[PDB]
Structures are given as structure tokens and as C-alpha cells.
Design an enzyme around this catalytic site. Sequence first.
Site: not given
Lengths: 75, 250
Positions: B124, B141, B194
Site C-alpha cells: 500500500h 491513507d 492507492c
Amino acid sequence: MQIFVKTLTGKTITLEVEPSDTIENVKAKIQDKEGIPPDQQRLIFAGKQLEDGRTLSDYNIQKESTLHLVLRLRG
Amino acid sequence: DMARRQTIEALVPAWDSDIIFKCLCYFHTLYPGLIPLETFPPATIFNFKQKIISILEDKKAVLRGEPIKGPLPICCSKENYRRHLQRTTLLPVFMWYHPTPKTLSDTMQTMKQLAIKGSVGASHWLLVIVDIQARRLVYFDSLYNYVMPPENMKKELQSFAQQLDQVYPAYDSKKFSVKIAAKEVIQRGSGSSCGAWCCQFLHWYLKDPLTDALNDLPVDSVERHENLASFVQACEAAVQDLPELSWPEA
């Protein structure tokens, strides 16, 4: 030649080569020992990227030099 | 839904460390206060704090006319790096994360293998923006709590902010503040987008450091990724002819 190649985990592997060798050759030498395909290898010296058709001497890369290996990471 | 994930995945595929880096280089030509920190390797949750402190200590050294002590970037000249350190007002600290490894060293190993393998896995991209000018730490995030609860990250970042106040004091008493950017899962319906999300959020932040863009996202998960796809397309067209692995001039 006695030179160093620095990796992203802070490890350096040493290779013996000649300036007349191609960038293609360095990538092939690194591949034999760490298994990464040359098409995946990116070589950096003195903040410059080395080009496949060139020789070490073209960039004036000399003995006791330190090289950078870049990895292309996914996320 | 299988359709929906298949299209959300098709819309915004994973971004690697190079497109992120080219994006940062490009963003610097737009916003010269942004220093295009290298993503090869990126920071991790285990060392992003010392990396930030190191960068800021080198910035102080440059502002004093002194040698820097911290590491040089790979794709930048010494002199250009000092000029970026002099100029920069914003550190885009990309962090590479994975739940498996529980140390720096293990993280770097896990990182290395997945690169040679070529897989995303459960890795991630996180982004910590260090806004020097506003004295703000922003934690983004796109998966909301993939590392930890946001309330936890806030507390950890608040104590870090307190040491940034010591390392890099302001002219006045102004203290580093912290912002947890995401208050819901941004990346709804994707397990891949992401990296792009981080750069879109960074760009929104560069345009307006008080951006409420996340709160103004459309509710629909496909519509989010359609819009993100358009951003991605713009970035790829803009960096198309920019130099590979080469910092722009400060």
C-alpha cells in the site's frame, strides 16, 4: 575492475568488469548473480542513468566507483 | 459488482515508484516548494520519522551555508540537491507499507522481492505531507485505517510533531499541527489505486492546503475512479516527455 553497486536494502555487490563492457554487459553480470532480468535493471552513476548501448568508459566510470541499482516497486 | 470491481480496477491500475516519482518531479515544476523525494526506496512506517528529521536537519544546514550530513539522492547533483533543500517548503514523503513485515529491515526485504517478482500483493502507498510553511503534518491513507486506527496515527503524529518543533523551530512559537486526511475509505471498491490517490490528494493539497476535496468526493465508488482515471491520464501525458530518473532543477 574493483567497483561497488549499492542496492536499496543498503547492500552492495562487487563485480569485476572492463570499461569496454557495455551497459548491457553490466546488467547481464548483475542478473547472473541476483536473477533480475536486464529489462528490469536501471543503472545510475554520479546521478546519471547509464544507457544500454554505451560502455563504462563512455561515462568515464573508473575503478573503486560506487553504482546505484534502481528497482521499480509496486503498491 | 464483479463487473464493478473489474471496471474500478481497469479504470485505475496500480502506480509504481517510477510514475509516482515522475509525478513528483513534474509537480515540482508546477510548485517549486515541493521537493521531489525519491521513491527508490520510499520511506516506511519504521523510518519515515528519522527520514523527515534528516531532511529538515540538512535543510537547516543549507540555510546556514554549511555542508549537509544526510544522504544524497541518487538522481540529483549535490549542488541541485542543496538548491532544492534551500527552496523546499513541502516534503512529499511517500511511504511503502505491508502488514507482514514488522521491522525496517524485513520491510525492505519484502519490498525487494515483490519488486523482482513484480507484484502488488497487499502492499500500500501512504503519503505524509510535511508542510514546512504551514507547519502541518498531513497523513493520507486511501484505505483509511490500513496501518492503524486514525485516532492512533493522530496521537503518534502529535508526539512526532512535538519533536519537529525542537528539530525545526519556527521564528515564533508556532507548533507543528497534524491532520488525518481521510475520514472514510477513499479508495472504495479498489485494491490498487492507492498510488494514484496519493498523487491526486497531493495535487489537491498543492492547489489548496486547506482542501476539503475528500469531503466533496462523489459518493459513488465508480464515479470516484472515473474522475481519478482522468487525473491519471493527465499526469501520464504531462510526464511523457520528462527525463527518466533525473531531478528537475530546483
